[PDB]
Design a protein around this ligand. Sequence first.
Ligand SMILES: Cc1ccc2oc(C#Cc3ccc(C(=O)O)cc3)c(CC(=O)O)c2c1
Ligand SMILES: Cc1ccc2oc(C#Cc3ccc(C(=O)O)cc3)c(CC(=O)O)c2c1
Lengths: 139, 139
Amino acid sequence: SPGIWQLDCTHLEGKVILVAVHVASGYIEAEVIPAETGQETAYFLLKLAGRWPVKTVHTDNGSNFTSTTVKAACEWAGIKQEFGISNKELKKIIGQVRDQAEHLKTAVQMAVFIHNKKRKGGIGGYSAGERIVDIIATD
Amino acid sequence: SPGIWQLDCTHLEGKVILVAVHVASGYIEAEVIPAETGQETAYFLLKLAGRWPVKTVHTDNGSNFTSTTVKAACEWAGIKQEFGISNKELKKIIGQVRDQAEHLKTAVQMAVFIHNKKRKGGIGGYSAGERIVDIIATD
Ligand SMILES: Cc1ccc2oc(C#Cc3ccc(C(=O)O)cc3)c(CC(=O)O)c2c1
Ligand SMILES: Cc1ccc2oc(C#Cc3ccc(C(=O)O)cc3)c(CC(=O)O)c2c1
């Protein structure tokens, strides 16, 4: 459970946002890429796996199953690719910040920041960022 | 101490690697950018700050003091920029992996992965990755 992530794509202003969700915490990492490709996905996974425990990645379609680069990233980093499994919450915050940022990728990272640091209902308990640290700190 | 980072640049194959070190853990985040610019630095800081507690960033020269974008990122994210303060360890591991990766940026992230996951002397105690989680988990 500390190593379980969901991976999805979302789209805004004709760009692609790669989104990884730490399922138990709701903690997010996101990346704006020029184009959906195996290589970009592989790179994102390798960066995420260098930063957090990533044991298993769930995706909801076949696209990641067709990349030899994703396959090599999986084997390099020890990530199990499993089939079968926030995007709209993220687009809401991106909409709140879009006009403080010249570039979409800036607004996406401002949205990721707010998502990971905020408390639920704006008061009490832990943010997603505190929750992932607390889940991992308990080995 | 949980929020204290050092920020530096390093260079390989004519590219620029942005390196942030969590001073108490030795945990690293790194990014290959096309060009040293204020904007790229600001973006890197905002991404790091969305992911970890970043309270204070130490740098060892004036370059980050001259960017209005870095200034705006600092104020947006609540990061204190302080003057006054791993690169060679990272270039060693990059040298070990360079030939498993077509792109330098891939080799840099493979190096970051090994740096953050390895134990000191290859046995016992915590990796940098476990150390940063343990330091933050103790609020
Ligand atoms: C308040 C704040 C905080 C962080 C920020 O990061 C950026 C940026 C950037 C960037 C642009 C282009 C490339 C590229 O060429 O790929 C890379 C990075 C800004 C500028 C903006 O967006 O308002 C910014 C502002
Ligand atoms: C085993 C393994 C693990 C992860 C990996 O990521 C990549 C990649 C990539 C990339 C290239 C170009 C852009 C760009 O156009 O900016 C962005 C990302 C690879 C391919 C390589 O480098 O060997 C790779 C392999």
